[PDB]
Write a protein that binds this DNA or RNA. Structure first.
Ligand SMILES: [Mg+2]
Ligand SMILES: [Mg+2]
Lengths: 683, 43
RNA sequence: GUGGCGGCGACGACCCAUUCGAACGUCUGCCCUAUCAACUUUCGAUGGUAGUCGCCGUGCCUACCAUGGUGACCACGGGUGAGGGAAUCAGGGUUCGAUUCCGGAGAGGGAGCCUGAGAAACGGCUACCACAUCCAAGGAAGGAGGCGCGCAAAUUACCCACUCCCGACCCGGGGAGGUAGUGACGAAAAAUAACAAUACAGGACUCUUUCGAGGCCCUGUAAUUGGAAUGAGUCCACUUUAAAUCCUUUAACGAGGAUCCAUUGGAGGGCAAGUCUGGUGCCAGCAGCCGCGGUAGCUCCAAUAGCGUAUAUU
C-alpha cells in the first residue's frame, strides 16, 4: 500500500537526544495531532533501550477519549490505532489545575494538549519531569492557534488578536521557538515546517561527560578515606559529592556553632545530599538529631536517603535501627521518629518548626525548606549547636549575610547539575530564558544621579515590551531582575500578569538622559499600577464590607502592585521620587498598539521580507500620554516596620489590618489609602 | 526502518507555511527598534 | 327524540363443583447384629384441661395437672460397595432387546429479610467472616476440569425439520431435544486374477542308514501367444436431509511383467589375485556389498491382512 517517506530529521533528532541524555521538543499542528503523538511515541520506543516509555497527558477541561476501559467499550458499541495506543501505553492523566500531584514523579514523555490555556506555572512543572531523551509534545488543534501562527511568520510585527486580553505570552512562546536548537515544528502529516533556521542543518552525531569524569575519579580516590567514600558511592552527580564532603567536614569540627547552607534549585538533588549527611552524623558519635520542616509529609525523600545511607553501611532494618511511623491518618506515612542503637543510643526526631523548646539537648538540627518557615522562627532554631540549612532556589539572604558578618562557621554550596538529565540541555535553557527564572550573577555598578531632583517617570509600553527583539528582551530581563529582587514573594506566574492582565500599567524612573547614549539606559525603580473601581479588587470590596459605605465604590482609583528600587541604590530615596511624580500625573498636573489583523484579512496578508510598519516606542514621556483622573491611591502589603515608616512618610493612612497572619511569612496584610471620607474611615 | 529512511503506512495555510523563503530567525535580524521615540535604530 | 331494542367474540371478576395436584393420617409388610437387655422423662417421655401458632387434626408448643409408654412375640443401641437396583413392555433360528423410576441437600461460610396459588427459592438485600479486581489514591464494582501413560482439538459446530414444554400466541423461544468426528483392545465378510492355445525338451514320483525296491495315459520350461470379465482408484448427475454428509441408484475413464508388485517367522545353497585367527605341506573355523582399475529380484517350509520376541505362569 502507498507509503510516505518522512524526513530523516525527525529520527535524527530523536536519536541524538537519547545519546546525549538531552530532551527535545515537538510542536504538532492540526486537529489530528492525537494521531501523530502515537507515531512519535513509537519512534521513541525504538531509540531507548532502558524500558517502555511512560506518557503524561495534560488537558484543561475535556478529553476526547474515555480513558476508562469499560466506558470506552460501551461508547464504541473498524479498528483505530489511537484506541489501541490508549490501552497499551502506561499513561498518567493530570489536570492543568491539579498539576501539583505530578511534581515528584518522572515520566518518559509529556503531552500538552491545550495550547491556549498554557500558564507559566504549568510549563515549569511538566517539563521538569521529562527525563533523558524524552519528548515534549505540544499540540495546536484550535483554528485560532493556526492563524496566529500563520500571521506571525508572514510579518513579524503583524499579529492577529480577536476582539479583552491581548495574550502576548503565547505570541512570545511562538517567537521563542526559533531560538531553541532541539525544536521541530510538524504537521498532521509527518512534515516539517522550516522556520527554526537550525532545522535544515540538523545532522546525525557520530556514535560520557566532563563532570562525570571527576565523579568516577572521586569515587575511586575516596575509597581510601571512608566511611566518607561509601556516601559518595551512593551519590549520582559530582556536585552532591562535593556537598557531602563539605557537610561531613563541618560535622568533624570541634566547634559548638557552625552552619552549612544548601542553595539548590529544583531538579537538582537536594534532599539526597541532606539524607546522606544525616547518615554521616549517625556514622559518627552524634546522638541527638532533630529535623524541622513545615510538614512531616514534605520530607519523604529525606528519610529515604537516610534509609538508603543506613543500608549501605550496616544498620539492618530491625537489628540495629527501628523506625516509628506517623500512626495517624493526617500527615500519614511520615517517619517522625527513628532510633538507632547500634553505637550506644542515637535518636533522630522530627519536630514542629515552632518548637524552640525541646531543643535544649541538641547536637545537630537540620532545617528543611527554610524559606517556607517564618523568619523569626528560624532565629530561635539557630541555638548553640550545629545547624544544617537547605533552601530551594526559585530575609533568608539577609540572614546568611548576617551569619557571614559573624561566631557561627559559614559554608556555602550550590547545586547546578540536574539528576534527571545531563547539563547543557537546550530544552531547559530555552525554558528558563522564556520564563525569566534566572538572574544575572553580577550587576554592573553605575553612577548615582541626584536623588530627589532630576529624575523623570516614563510610561513603558506593554506591547513592544514583550516582542522578542533583542533590545526589548534585555530591558525585559533588567526590569524583572529588579522586580523579582523585591521582598515580595516571587512566582513565575507574575510574568503573565504583566503580559496579559488588563488595567495594568508599568512606570519606570530613569536617570537624566543626555543626548547621546548607549543601547539601553539603566533603570533605577519600576512601579506597577492596577486601575480599580469605576475605571473589582481588594481595596473596593474590603473597604465596602468593613465600613458599609454606599458612596464608596463609585469612585475611581488605582493601587500600587509592586514598588521596588535597585538594592545598591536602596535607602537614598528613589522610591519617594516616583510616588510624587505619579501623583502629579494622575491629578492632571502634567500637560496631556501594534497593528491588528482583521478576521477576514488573515489569508490576504502576504510575506513581507523586510518589516516596514513602525514599531511603537518602548518608553513614552508622561506629558505625551493622557492621564486618567484617579480619586485615591492604595497599597496592600504585609505589615513590616521598614515599609510602615515608608508609606506613612508617603502620606498613606491605614484603613485595614488583617486579623490572621499569613502562614508563610507570619505577617498581617495591611491596606492603606491616600487621595473627608478617609477621615471617617480612619476614625 | 530500512537503515536509510523511514516509511510509515487550513491545509492551504500550511502549504504557505511550508513554502517560506525567509525563516523567522532571518526575519528577526532585519527588525529594528526605536527608543525615546527618536534615536538610531539598535537593530 | 341526551327515543326504545338489540349479535357474535376478547379480558377480568365473588362463590360452588371438577381436574392437576400438594400435605397429614389408618392398615399391611423391611437386611445384619443379643459378646446391644432394658429404654423413654438428657430441655416432653404417656395422657388430661385451657390456650398460642399453624391451611387444618395433633405435645406442634407453652402454662397447670397425673405417672405413665415400649420390650425375649427381641424394645433400645450399633451396623449394612441400604455406582448399584427396581421394575416395565415386546418377541418363530435359544433377547449382544428396549426404556423408566429415586433418598435429599447446596449455590465463597453460617444467620436475617423480600414475592408468589405453589420456594423457608437454581434467582436480589443487610451485617460478619474470606477471597480477588480497577483507579487521577478520594473511591467503586464482584459470587465449573484438563494434564501428570513423548502427551490437552466434542472445552466445539448446525437447527428448532422430529418428540414435547412456556408465553398475550396457529407463527416467537428452548445448550429440553435432534444431526455431524478418531479408532490393528476386539468381532464378522473379502480382492491381489480366470479361461484357452502354441513351441521345445525327456524324465517325473514314493519307500529306503550311501548297493537298492517299486513306477508311469504325463511332467517342466522366471518359455512365448490370444481376446473376454472386473474393481482399487478417478469423477458427472439425481435421491437423501431444516441444510449437508452417509447408505441406495447411475453417466463417463480405469489391466499383461495385469511394476495397479502381501507380509511376518524358521531352515538351507551359492563366491574373489578379499581380511583375520589356529594347525594336521595344498587344511579347518569365522565370515564375505570392502577385490587390481573404474560410478556412469536364490530355494524350501508354517500362518496369511496378519505374524513374533521377553518375564511370570497353568
Ligand atoms: Mg481385525
Ligand atoms: Mg492378454
Amino acid at each position: 500500500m502507498h507509503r510516505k517517506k518522512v524526513d530523516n530529521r525527525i529520527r535524527i533528532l530523536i536519536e541524538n537526544g537519547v545519546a546525549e541524555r538531552q530532551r527535545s521538543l515537538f510542536v504538532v499542528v492540526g486537529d489530528r495531532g492525537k494521531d501523530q503523538v502515537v507515531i512519535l511515541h513509537h519512534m521513541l520506543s525504538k531509540a531507548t533501550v532502558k524500558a517502555r516509555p511512560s506518557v503524561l497527558w495534560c488537558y484543561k477541561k475535556e478529553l476526547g477519549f474515555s480513558s476508562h476501559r469499560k466506558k470506552r467499550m460501551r461508547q464504541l458499541q473498524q479498528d483505530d490505532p489511537f484506541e489501541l495506543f490508549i490501552a497499551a501505553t502506561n499513561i498518567r492523566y493530570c489536570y492543568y489545575n491539579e498539576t501539583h500531584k505530578i511534581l515528584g514523579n518522572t515520566f518518559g514523555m509529556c503531552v500538552l494538549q491545550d495550547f491556549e490555556a498554557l500558564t507559566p506555572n504549568l510549563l515549569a512543572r511538566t517539563v521538569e519531569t521529562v527525563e533523558g531523551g524524552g519528548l515534549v509534545v505540544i499540540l495546536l488543534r484550535t483554528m485560532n492557534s493556526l492563524k496566529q501562527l500563520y500571521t506571525v511568520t508572514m510579518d513579524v510585527h503583524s499579529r492577529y488578536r480577536t476582539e479583552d486580553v491581548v495574550g502576548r505570552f503565547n505570541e512570545r512562546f511562538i517567537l521563542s521557538l526559533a531560538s531553541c536548537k532541539k525544536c521541530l515544528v510538524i504537521d498532521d502529516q509527518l512534515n516539517i515546517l522550516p522556520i527554526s533556521s537550525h532545522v535544515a542543518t540538523m545532522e546525525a552525531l557520530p556514535p560520557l561527560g566532563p563532570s562525570d569524569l571527576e565523579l568516577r575519579e572521586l569515587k575511586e580516590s575516596l575509597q581510601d578515606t571512608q566511611p566518607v567514600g561509601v556516601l559518595v558511592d551512593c551519590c549520582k552527580t559530582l556536585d552532591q559529592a562535593k556537598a557531602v564532603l563539605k557537610f561531613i567536614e563541618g560535622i568533624s569540627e570541634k566547634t559548638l556553632r557552625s552552619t552549612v547552607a544548601l542553595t539548590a534549585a529544583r531538579g537538582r538533588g537536594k534532599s539526597a545530599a541532606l539524607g546522606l549527611a544525616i547518615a554521616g552524623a549517625v556514622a559518627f558519635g552524634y546522638s541527638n538529631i532533630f529535623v524541622t520542616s513545615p510538614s512531616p509529609d514534605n520530607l519523604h525523600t529525606l528519610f529515604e536517603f537516610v534509609f538508603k545511607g543506613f543500608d549501605a553501611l550496616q544498620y539492618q532494618e530491625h537489628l540495629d535501627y527501628e523506625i516509628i511511623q506517623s500512626l495517624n491518618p493526617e500527615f500519614n506515612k511520615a517517619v517522625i521518629r527513628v532510633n538507632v542503637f547500634r553505637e550506644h543510643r542515637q535518636t533522630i526526631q522530627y519536630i514542629h518548626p515552632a518548637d524552640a523548646v525541646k531543643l535544649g539537648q541538641a547536637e545537630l538540627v537540620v532545617i528543611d525548606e527554610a524559606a517556607a518557615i517564618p523568619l523569626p522562627l528560624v532565629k530561635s532554631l539557630l541555638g548553640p549547636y550545629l545547624v544544617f540549612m537547605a533552601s530551594t532556589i526559585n530575609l533568608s539572604l539577609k540572614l546568611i549575610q548576617q551569619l557571614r558578618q559573624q561566631a557561627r562557621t559559614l559554608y556555602e554550596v550550590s547545586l547546578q547539575e540536574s539528576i534527571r538529565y545531563a547539563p547543557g540541555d537546550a530544552v531547559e535553557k530555552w525554558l528558563n530564558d522564556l520564563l525569566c527564572l534566572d538572574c544575572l550573577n553580577i550587576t554592573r555598578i553605575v553612577s548615582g544621579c541626584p536623588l530627589p531632583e532630576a529624575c523623570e517617570l516614563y510610561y513603558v509600553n506593554r506591547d513592544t515590551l514583550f516582542c522578542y527583539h533583542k533590545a526589548s528582551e534585555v530591558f525585559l530581563q533588567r526590569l524583572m531582575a529588579l522586580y523579582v529582587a523585591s521582598h515580595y514573594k516571587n512566582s513565575p506566574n507574575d510574568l503573565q500578569m504583566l503580559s496579559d492582565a488588563p488595567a495594568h500599567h508599568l512606570f519606570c524612573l530613569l536617570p537624566p538622559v543626555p543626548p547621546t547614549q548607549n543601547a539601553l539606559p539603566e533603570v533605577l525603580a519600576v512601579i506597577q499600577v492596577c486601575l480599580e473601581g469605576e475605571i473589582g479588587d481588594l481595596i473596593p470590596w474590603t473597604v465596602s464590607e468593613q465600613f458599609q459605605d454606599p458612596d464608596f465604590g463609585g469612585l475611581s482609583g488605582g493601587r500600587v502592585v509592586r514598588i521596588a528600587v535597585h538594592p545598591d541604590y536602596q535607602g537614598m530615596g528613589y522610591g519617594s521620587r516616583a510616588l510624587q511624580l505619579l501623583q502629579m500625573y494622575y491629578e492632571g498636573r502634567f500637560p496631556c498598539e501594534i497593528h491588528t489583523v482583521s478576521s477576514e484579512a488573515v489569508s490576504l496578508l502576504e510575506e513581507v521580507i523586510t518589516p516596514r510598519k513602525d514599531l511603537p516606542p518602548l518608553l513614552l514621556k508622561l506629558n505625551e500620554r493622557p492621564a486618567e483622573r484617579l480619586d485615591y491611591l492604595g497599597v496592600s502589603y504585609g505589615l513590616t516596620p521598614r515599609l510602615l515608616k515608608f508609606w506613612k512618610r508617603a502620606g498613606f493612612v491605614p484603613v485595614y489590618l488583617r486579623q490572621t497572619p499569613n502562614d508563610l511569612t507570619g505577617e498581617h496584610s495591611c491596606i492603606m489609602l491616600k487621595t473627608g471620607w478617609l477621615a471617617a474611615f480612619w476614625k | 526502518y530500512d537503515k536509510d529512511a523511514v516509511y510509515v503506512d487550513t491545509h492551504e495555510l500550511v502549504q504557505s507555511l511550508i513554502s517560506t523563503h525567509s525563516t523567522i530567525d532571518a526575519k528577526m535580524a532585519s527588525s529594528r527598534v526605536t527608543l525615546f521615540s527618536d534615536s538610531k535604530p539598535l537593530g
